[PDB]
Design a protein around this ligand. Sequence first.
Ligand code: HEM
Ligand SMILES: [Ca+2]
Ligand SMILES: [Ca+2]
Length: 306
Amino acid sequence: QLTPTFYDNSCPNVSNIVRDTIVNELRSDPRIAASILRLHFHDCFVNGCDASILLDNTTSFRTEKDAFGNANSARGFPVIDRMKAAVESACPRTVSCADLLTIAAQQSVTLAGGPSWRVPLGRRDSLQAFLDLANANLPAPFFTLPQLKDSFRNVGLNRSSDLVALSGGHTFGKNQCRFIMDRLYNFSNTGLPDPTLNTTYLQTLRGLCPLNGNLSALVDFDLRTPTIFDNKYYVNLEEQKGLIQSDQELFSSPNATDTIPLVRSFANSTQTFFNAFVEAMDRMGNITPLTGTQGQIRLNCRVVNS
Ligand code: HEM
Ligand SMILES: [Ca+2]
Ligand SMILES: [Ca+2]
């Protein structure tokens, strides 16, 4: 059983070391908090939160870093190496990369203005990476609501609240033009923009992402507060201003009878959202963890111990 007090005796300063690292990095890279939270999400959706995503290539297994959802998208790996080294110095061979990344995600959310809580701990590190599983398990922005629900249920999150609350991670961070080009110019081969995208916002996005333009150009997920972790993401959805298809479907999909009330509830109360986010975050963080003597306490998050 994972417990928030796991390192209270072996490494009481772990959370503070993680926080300090993120604070330092945020000065030069204001996007790092968002990037780290996403790394934890992509770690947990593939064989559970086991730091499998942090492993680099080997001749026996490919890295998840080359999965369609991670390649030229996932970032922050060097920062994780930095805090790991700092933690290893303070507490040699004690904190797993899986736990480190979980704490980092929580601290990132808090530093961005979100809720503060102690995450359950005790996870251990994987002995391999899972590229095929990552390609199969990570959701895509073009997924329909039924597909998004399927993706979450596939890893163990059955509740619509899990999906709606965790999608709140898009209250900050960046998204490449490539992922919304269809919504802007030719949605579902209709030759027209996605009708669920506010027409005024449509114009703005088309200006940032012109046809035949730089597909790697970055756009803010939350037009209200781009770098602050708050409930503004849901207010945008109510106005048809969700950035990607998967965001807006939570409010506009024909299958959204169960998600609409959640979207409204989170848009109406920061407290309601923050509570739901913590609850869902801990549930995602409890996905098939390695515990006890299973797996290892990886020393270098990029390679399995030898
Ligand atoms: C519900 C399905 C989801 C889909 C389809 C999805 C899709 C995406 C896409 C397309 C990007 C842009 C990547 C890029 O342009 O490089 C992204 C970024 C991001 N996602 Fe999601 N996401 C989902 C759920 C979540 C969840 C559950 C979290 C965390 C709780 C999360 C946190 C983030 C963050 C913070 C970013 C910004 C990262 C950065 O700026 O470096 N996402 N997501
Ligand atoms: Ca994983
Ligand atoms: Ca925001």
